[PDB]
Design an enzyme around this catalytic site. Structure first.
Site, PDB file in Angstrom:
ATOM      1  N   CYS A 109      39.740  40.744  33.355  1.00  0.00           N
ATOM      2  CA  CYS A 109      40.071  40.128  34.631  1.00  0.00           C
ATOM      3  C   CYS A 109      41.337  39.309  34.472  1.00  0.00           C
ATOM      4  CB  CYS A 109      38.868  39.325  35.146  1.00  0.00           C
ATOM      5  SG  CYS A 109      38.793  39.077  36.886  1.00  0.00           S
ATOM      6  N   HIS A 129      42.402  42.129  36.784  1.00  0.00           N
ATOM      7  CA  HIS A 129      41.923  42.024  38.144  1.00  0.00           C
ATOM      8  C   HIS A 129      43.068  42.312  39.093  1.00  0.00           C
ATOM      9  CE1 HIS A 129      40.030  40.528  41.801  1.00  0.00           C
ATOM     10  NE2 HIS A 129      38.904  40.689  41.121  1.00  0.00           N
TER      11      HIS A 129
END
Lengths: 192, 192
Positions: A109, A129
């Site tokens: 992420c 992400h």
């Protein structure tokens, strides 16, 4: 020696880390027989995560670094967590050592943005992400991928909480091979 | 009053709980704006989970029960965790009160076997981890389902670590509705 090597992982836990992205890889790697140290960036005290879950580390990072080296270094995400990883000189030194010795570095992420901060893996293909893509790609030091898990040499990256199991199984496969990963996956009741 | 009610969840955390099954619902429910209390069965001290992750509870169960009632009571799995939930008279009393007041009870993997122990929800359709089915169905007090998430009135059950996001989103939907669940799902990068 033994065809069943024991492998070791370092998971660096900073205040504001995403707790799902921390716990899922720790649990899955331990299921695989990997020895995992959850090391607190700030010491051994409990760490408040992004949604206020409080996790007790196994060790301080100061002590865990002395007990290296590790087969994989794992960087969870979380906005504040990744910022704290990016500002830490101790994290810089661990990642550079890991890159020099050709060890695996895994980040998920917003975690990959700490690679940018510490100048790790330039030229690699990475994912993040979606909300962190612009940050990661500032300066054009990487090639971007939209794959849920991306592996480019010794840099393994993934996108978000919902890719955490895929990320963790990719670490297991890289360290212990496909058969052990298949063992660990079997009772998890993953969709596919 | 306000069309945006704040809802509250109690997550009961016992030694040996599955840490993924604990953290994923806590995090997702907090993302949804639900007020979540992680209550330690044995008190406020840190809890060692099934793969040795150590989680600090928000409160003891003794104190959390006084601050009820809760819109949902959540039982994680883990073999030892579910055994400890099954042996606790305090858990018995919370679940019976929750059933009497028509509140939601949610349990995952081996967690549903604590419903059997405390005689909760007989006649309901439930699922469990596949490895816990025989235990759950001893005595024929339930109807078994192989769905990844099963909801029968106020009993919500699910199968394993890999169904934890589905389970957590089902709790959010039941409490706060489909639109809030869609909000929370959006940045998770779930497969579907």
């Amino acid at each position: 020696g033994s065809h069943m090597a024991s492998k070791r992982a370092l998971v660096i836990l900073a205040k504001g880390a995403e707790e799902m992205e921390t716990v899922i890889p720790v649990d899955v790697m331990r299921r695989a027989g990997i020895k995992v140290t959850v090391a607190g960036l700030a010491g051994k005290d409990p760490v408040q995560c992004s949604r206020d879950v409080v996790i007790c580390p196994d060790a301080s990072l100061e002590d865990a670094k002395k007990e290296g080296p590790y087969d994989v270094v794992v960087l969870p995400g979380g906005n504040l967590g990744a910022q704290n990883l990016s500002e830490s000189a101790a994290v810089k030194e661990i990642l550079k050592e890991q890159e020099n010795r050709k060890g695996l570095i895994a980040a998920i992420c917003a975690g990959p943005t700490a690679l940018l901060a510490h100048e790790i893996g330039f030229g690699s293909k990475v994912t993040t992400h979606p909300l962190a893509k612009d940050k990661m790609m500032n300066g054009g030091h990487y090639t971007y991928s939209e794959n849920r898990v991306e592996k480019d040499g010794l840099i393994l990256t993934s996108r978000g909480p919902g890719t955490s199991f895929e990320f963790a199984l990719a670490i297991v496969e890289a360290l212990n091979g496909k058969e052990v990963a298949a063992q660990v996956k079997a009772p998890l009741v993953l969709k596919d």
